[PDB]
Design a protein around this ligand. Sequence first.
Ligand SMILES: [K+]
Ligand SMILES: [K+]
Ligand SMILES: [K+]
Ligand SMILES: [K+]
Ligand SMILES: [K+]
Ligand SMILES: [K+]
Ligand SMILES: [K+]
Ligand SMILES: [K+]
Ligand SMILES: [K+]
Ligand SMILES: [K+]
Ligand SMILES: [K+]
Ligand SMILES: [K+]
Ligand SMILES: [K+]
Ligand SMILES: [K+]
Ligand SMILES: [K+]
Ligand SMILES: [K+]
Ligand SMILES: [K+]
Ligand SMILES: [K+]
Ligand SMILES: [K+]
Ligand SMILES: [Mg+2]
Ligand SMILES: [Mg+2]
Ligand SMILES: [Mg+2]
Ligand SMILES: [Mg+2]
Ligand SMILES: [Mg+2]
Ligand SMILES: [Mg+2]
Ligand SMILES: [Mg+2]
Ligand SMILES: [Mg+2]
Ligand SMILES: [Mg+2]
Ligand SMILES: [Mg+2]
Ligand SMILES: [Mg+2]
Ligand SMILES: [Mg+2]
Ligand SMILES: [Mg+2]
Ligand SMILES: [Mg+2]
Ligand SMILES: [Mg+2]
Ligand SMILES: [Mg+2]
Ligand SMILES: [Mg+2]
Ligand SMILES: [Mg+2]
Ligand SMILES: [Mg+2]
Ligand SMILES: [Mg+2]
Ligand SMILES: [Mg+2]
Ligand SMILES: [Mg+2]
Ligand SMILES: [Mg+2]
Ligand SMILES: [Mg+2]
Ligand SMILES: [Mg+2]
Ligand SMILES: [Mg+2]
Ligand SMILES: [Mg+2]
Ligand SMILES: [Mg+2]
Ligand SMILES: [Mg+2]
Ligand SMILES: [Mg+2]
Ligand SMILES: [Mg+2]
Ligand SMILES: [Mg+2]
Ligand SMILES: [Mg+2]
Ligand SMILES: [Mg+2]
Ligand SMILES: [Mg+2]
Ligand SMILES: [Mg+2]
Ligand SMILES: [Mg+2]
Ligand SMILES: [Mg+2]
Ligand SMILES: [Mg+2]
Ligand SMILES: [Mg+2]
Ligand SMILES: [Mg+2]
Ligand SMILES: [Mg+2]
Ligand SMILES: [Mg+2]
Ligand SMILES: [Mg+2]
Ligand SMILES: [Mg+2]
Ligand SMILES: [Mg+2]
Ligand SMILES: [Mg+2]
Ligand SMILES: [Mg+2]
Ligand SMILES: [Mg+2]
Ligand SMILES: [Mg+2]
Ligand SMILES: [Mg+2]
Ligand SMILES: [Mg+2]
Ligand SMILES: [Mg+2]
Ligand SMILES: [Mg+2]
Ligand SMILES: [Mg+2]
Ligand SMILES: [Mg+2]
Ligand SMILES: [Mg+2]
Ligand SMILES: [Mg+2]
Ligand SMILES: [Mg+2]
Ligand SMILES: [Mg+2]
Ligand SMILES: [Mg+2]
Ligand SMILES: [Mg+2]
Ligand SMILES: [Mg+2]
Ligand SMILES: [Mg+2]
Ligand SMILES: [Mg+2]
Ligand SMILES: [Mg+2]
Ligand SMILES: [Mg+2]
Ligand SMILES: [Mg+2]
Ligand SMILES: [Mg+2]
Lengths: 74, 64, 50
Amino acid sequence: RNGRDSEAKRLGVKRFGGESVLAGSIIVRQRGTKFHAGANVGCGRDHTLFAKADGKVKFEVKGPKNRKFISIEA
Amino acid sequence: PKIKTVRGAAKRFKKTGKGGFKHKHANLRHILTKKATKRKRHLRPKAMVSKGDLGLVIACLPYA
Amino acid sequence: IREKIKLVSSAGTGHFYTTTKNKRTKPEKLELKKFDPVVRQHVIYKEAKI
RNA sequence: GAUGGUAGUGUGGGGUCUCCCCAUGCGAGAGUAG
RNA sequence: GAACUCGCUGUGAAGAUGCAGUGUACCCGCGGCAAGACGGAAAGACCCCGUGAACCUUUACUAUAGCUUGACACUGAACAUGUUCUAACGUUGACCCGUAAUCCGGGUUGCGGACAGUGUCUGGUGGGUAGUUUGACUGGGGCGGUCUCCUCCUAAAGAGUAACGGAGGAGCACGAAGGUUGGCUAAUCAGGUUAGUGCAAUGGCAUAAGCCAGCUUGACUGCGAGCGUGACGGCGCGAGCAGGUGCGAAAGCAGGUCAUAGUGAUCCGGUGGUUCUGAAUGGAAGGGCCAUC
RNA sequence: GUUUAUUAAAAACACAGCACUGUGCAAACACGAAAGUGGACGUAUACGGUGUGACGCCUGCCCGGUGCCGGAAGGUUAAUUGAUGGGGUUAGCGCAAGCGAAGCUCUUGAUCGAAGCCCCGGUAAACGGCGUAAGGUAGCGA
RNA sequence: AGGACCGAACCGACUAAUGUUGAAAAAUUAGCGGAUGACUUGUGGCUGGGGGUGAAAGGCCAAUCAAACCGGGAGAUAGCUGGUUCUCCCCGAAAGCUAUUUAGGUAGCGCCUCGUGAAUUCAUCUCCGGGGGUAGAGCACUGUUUCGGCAACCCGAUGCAAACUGCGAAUACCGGAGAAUGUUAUCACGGGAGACACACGGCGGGUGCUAACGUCCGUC
RNA sequence: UUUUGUAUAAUGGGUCAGCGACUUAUAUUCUGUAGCAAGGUUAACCGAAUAGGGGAGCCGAAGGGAAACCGAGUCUUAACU
RNA sequence: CCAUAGGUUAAUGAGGCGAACCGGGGGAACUGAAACAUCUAAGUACCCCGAGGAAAAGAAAUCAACCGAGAUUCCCCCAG
Ligand SMILES: [K+]
Ligand SMILES: [K+]
Ligand SMILES: [K+]
Ligand SMILES: [K+]
Ligand SMILES: [K+]
Ligand SMILES: [K+]
Ligand SMILES: [K+]
Ligand SMILES: [K+]
Ligand SMILES: [K+]
Ligand SMILES: [K+]
Ligand SMILES: [K+]
Ligand SMILES: [K+]
Ligand SMILES: [K+]
Ligand SMILES: [K+]
Ligand SMILES: [K+]
Ligand SMILES: [K+]
Ligand SMILES: [K+]
Ligand SMILES: [K+]
Ligand SMILES: [K+]
Ligand SMILES: [Mg+2]
Ligand SMILES: [Mg+2]
Ligand SMILES: [Mg+2]
Ligand SMILES: [Mg+2]
Ligand SMILES: [Mg+2]
Ligand SMILES: [Mg+2]
Ligand SMILES: [Mg+2]
Ligand SMILES: [Mg+2]
Ligand SMILES: [Mg+2]
Ligand SMILES: [Mg+2]
Ligand SMILES: [Mg+2]
Ligand SMILES: [Mg+2]
Ligand SMILES: [Mg+2]
Ligand SMILES: [Mg+2]
Ligand SMILES: [Mg+2]
Ligand SMILES: [Mg+2]
Ligand SMILES: [Mg+2]
Ligand SMILES: [Mg+2]
Ligand SMILES: [Mg+2]
Ligand SMILES: [Mg+2]
Ligand SMILES: [Mg+2]
Ligand SMILES: [Mg+2]
Ligand SMILES: [Mg+2]
Ligand SMILES: [Mg+2]
Ligand SMILES: [Mg+2]
Ligand SMILES: [Mg+2]
Ligand SMILES: [Mg+2]
Ligand SMILES: [Mg+2]
Ligand SMILES: [Mg+2]
Ligand SMILES: [Mg+2]
Ligand SMILES: [Mg+2]
Ligand SMILES: [Mg+2]
Ligand SMILES: [Mg+2]
Ligand SMILES: [Mg+2]
Ligand SMILES: [Mg+2]
Ligand SMILES: [Mg+2]
Ligand SMILES: [Mg+2]
Ligand SMILES: [Mg+2]
Ligand SMILES: [Mg+2]
Ligand SMILES: [Mg+2]
Ligand SMILES: [Mg+2]
Ligand SMILES: [Mg+2]
Ligand SMILES: [Mg+2]
Ligand SMILES: [Mg+2]
Ligand SMILES: [Mg+2]
Ligand SMILES: [Mg+2]
Ligand SMILES: [Mg+2]
Ligand SMILES: [Mg+2]
Ligand SMILES: [Mg+2]
Ligand SMILES: [Mg+2]
Ligand SMILES: [Mg+2]
Ligand SMILES: [Mg+2]
Ligand SMILES: [Mg+2]
Ligand SMILES: [Mg+2]
Ligand SMILES: [Mg+2]
Ligand SMILES: [Mg+2]
Ligand SMILES: [Mg+2]
Ligand SMILES: [Mg+2]
Ligand SMILES: [Mg+2]
Ligand SMILES: [Mg+2]
Ligand SMILES: [Mg+2]
Ligand SMILES: [Mg+2]
Ligand SMILES: [Mg+2]
Ligand SMILES: [Mg+2]
Ligand SMILES: [Mg+2]
Ligand SMILES: [Mg+2]
Ligand SMILES: [Mg+2]
Ligand SMILES: [Mg+2]
Ligand SMILES: [Mg+2]
């Protein structure tokens, strides 16, 4: 009755804290927002977080909800 | 005897200035309504044959 | 169940869009203002056969 | 929310080897004083 | 293959004269016996595999001889659609001649007669005959199950990761269920999402991603810095730029939908469009390009 | 009687007998691109094919399926025939946009059209079946 | 009279032994059947290979038969098996992924080699910047579970979980900085491959019986 | 030899001598080497000629675009930051 | 019935053989397509007929492109 699975989706963190990015670079692929778009970061339609500026990646526990934000530091 | 061109290949590839090959993209013949405009717009321009495929193409086109 | 249809320009060019439609639930012909890139203006587009 | 101990564990070695132990490094969670 | 060719218990490509340990054994015939030398003989016939072969079967596929249908031809006349007619044609009736000849031909006559028959074309039938096809995975093969896609676990805290491992889904829906602005907040009978999400599971969701209303078509066209993921074909995310549009007071937001399934390369062809091509030339046909089936 | 020369001699094959069916003679049928030839110098008491297998007593029910036979109202339907529409070209007429005869041409495919098939019957010593076409009779039975 | 009877010749071939590098590529010996017939035999003739002939065994057609023999197409094709010959020096795999009428074949990629070119390009270690949800743990959640108090719910105490998480390591991985060391150890492009049957052992697991010198992954 | 693995009780060889398996033609690409160099080279053929003649061709010095066409640009688009 | 078929004799020629090449009449399959049917192998092998020192072909109802060429045959290009 079993014997099915789907293709693994290659989700996860593509650029970790302190790595240099160009604008456009994907930082995390995810289902929903485990991570949230901080400063200089967009959120794509599949909740991909991507750099809007050149700079370094910065993850932070920020908000009243203890939520994890991806931002690009100049 | 002269090597014979693979004539199917010659209808699908053209040699560029620096010796690579441009081809037309797959997936833009039919079943177009369900496809996104963005997808279809990016399939219009001709693309280059990749590194892995060049050996296969060159074999087919000895008079490229 | 959904059937493919042609949204065709009122501008008189031949730019058509394509979409689907549930003809059983929506028997009336669909009409929408959409960008015609020949005349380069938003015009009325009206349903026609695919 | 310490401290201490315990669990786990990288490397090397060992045993009675379904599981452990020793050397060394890292060291929780829970609970406790607070 | 070469031999200076013992037993045993172990070992070991897993059943040893040849390895280890050990026991026994002076050298060499002759007659006997067949327990072993996985003895000799035949590149296992069983079994599986090969996109091997053959022959056989059939309502497997494609053909096809044969049989059969009609049209046209050979093939005509007169009356009316049918009937009559004779002259084509048939005769495996009779007779005559070549001729000594149950062949054959020619002649005369009878009978049949535009029929029959044959050619070309054409529908049917057609294992009579022929060429072939008849998947793969698989704790042997078959039978059963499975084959693409999505979600979770196995998966060893980056990614990825197998089994006929453990559990479920998809092959859509929606011109609103899309866009925006402004409001609004559940299950349950005590509280805070324990509800909701168009449809599985997981991750998300209050700034709600839930729900409602008004106004709308951004379910825009041309592009795209950069990046993710693939052997590749591809697939995905994407600021920003140009044009034009919607909502909003404006900042802004909008290139379909909370996200992750809802899919099919190429060929061949259809449809519309087209500052392209047009085999002497002008056209056209066909081809190209764009959109789409 | 016959048979697997060389591992099978049999319950297998054949057989007289039986039945069905074809065949009117230039027979059906067979060998042959054909001419011919066999059938047969035979003619339905004959000949071919098929099944059964001396003899005795017998051989039930089913025609829905497949085949065969008969039917031809109705439907569908080939070559053939080429209506009718559309396109291409261009003598002309347009100041130009276009329009456009004839001829030629590309295409469309009305009408005509047989058998077959669907359809209506028959047929089981046809292939078969015998709890739906009909439900296994007689006889026999570990 | 008779496909009548008994039985030699003659024609067969039921049984057994022998023989089985035979006396013999089918016989001999002792028995056995038919023996006036659908009998047997001499000579000659005819039928030809998808063809013949067949009282039917796929029998027989020159010791050959589910398509004779000889020559030719012909060196058919063989993803299969076998074999592949002198010497030295340098480097040195893979038995994986993806796809495949694919699975013992093949292609791209990975890994080997040779050449060309170029960044402190790469590695180890130290320090710095990261994201984890595994081990362990726990029980608020999803479930499961025991006991007590009250009796619908909840509470106290106690366990359990690959598809539980109000926690959470070691390691590993990504990035940055620095020294030392290392024949550039790295990356790119180009010539040539082989390989895509792996095995056992350690560790982490699925499966199996925490059975297998079992089977399937990850990693050394 | 074949294999994960063979003293293997897997394969092959009784022995010796002789023979017995990556070739050849043409095309194409890369490397080395030689000539000439923005050029290089001729084919058939002629020629008594390994000479010499023969430059028909071929490759190269330009690309882009499906194509018309444009050209150190060109294509894309109404037009490119 | 004229005749014509037929009959007889004469003269002349043919016949049969031979390696390839050549023109014509027929015409496979293995094989390749990683199966296979279109397609391929290939108008090949093979069979048959006929001829000659050669055969066949041959003086445009040919090309070309508005400029022109000038029968046929063979070689090198064009061009995989
Ligand atoms: K010993
Ligand atoms: K013995
Ligand atoms: K007639
Ligand atoms: K298995
Ligand atoms: K097994
Ligand atoms: K815009
Ligand atoms: K007998
Ligand atoms: K019937
Ligand atoms: K044969
Ligand atoms: K490969
Ligand atoms: K290489
Ligand atoms: K292992
Ligand atoms: K083996
Ligand atoms: K053996
Ligand atoms: K070469
Ligand atoms: K050279
Ligand atoms: K450019
Ligand atoms: K063939
Ligand atoms: K093949
Ligand atoms: Mg998944
Ligand atoms: Mg298209
Ligand atoms: Mg502590
Ligand atoms: Mg603690
Ligand atoms: Mg032993
Ligand atoms: Mg002896
Ligand atoms: Mg003996
Ligand atoms: Mg033996
Ligand atoms: Mg064998
Ligand atoms: Mg007729
Ligand atoms: Mg048939
Ligand atoms: Mg057949
Ligand atoms: Mg074949
Ligand atoms: Mg076959
Ligand atoms: Mg299989
Ligand atoms: Mg992971
Ligand atoms: Mg890990
Ligand atoms: Mg997986
Ligand atoms: Mg792996
Ligand atoms: Mg694997
Ligand atoms: Mg799996
Ligand atoms: Mg770019
Ligand atoms: Mg604008
Ligand atoms: Mg939706
Ligand atoms: Mg959804
Ligand atoms: Mg076609
Ligand atoms: Mg067109
Ligand atoms: Mg023209
Ligand atoms: Mg008898
Ligand atoms: Mg016998
Ligand atoms: Mg016998
Ligand atoms: Mg007769
Ligand atoms: Mg019988
Ligand atoms: Mg009987
Ligand atoms: Mg009829
Ligand atoms: Mg009846
Ligand atoms: Mg008698
Ligand atoms: Mg006999
Ligand atoms: Mg005897
Ligand atoms: Mg007797
Ligand atoms: Mg007797
Ligand atoms: Mg048999
Ligand atoms: Mg014989
Ligand atoms: Mg055969
Ligand atoms: Mg051949
Ligand atoms: Mg051979
Ligand atoms: Mg070495
Ligand atoms: Mg795949
Ligand atoms: Mg645990
Ligand atoms: Mg867990
Ligand atoms: Mg590092
Ligand atoms: Mg393989
Ligand atoms: Mg493998
Ligand atoms: Mg394996
Ligand atoms: Mg393995
Ligand atoms: Mg293990
Ligand atoms: Mg085990
Ligand atoms: Mg094993
Ligand atoms: Mg083995
Ligand atoms: Mg050994
Ligand atoms: Mg031995
Ligand atoms: Mg051996
Ligand atoms: Mg072998
Ligand atoms: Mg041997
Ligand atoms: Mg150019
Ligand atoms: Mg083939
Ligand atoms: Mg002569
Ligand atoms: Mg001549
Ligand atoms: Mg002139």
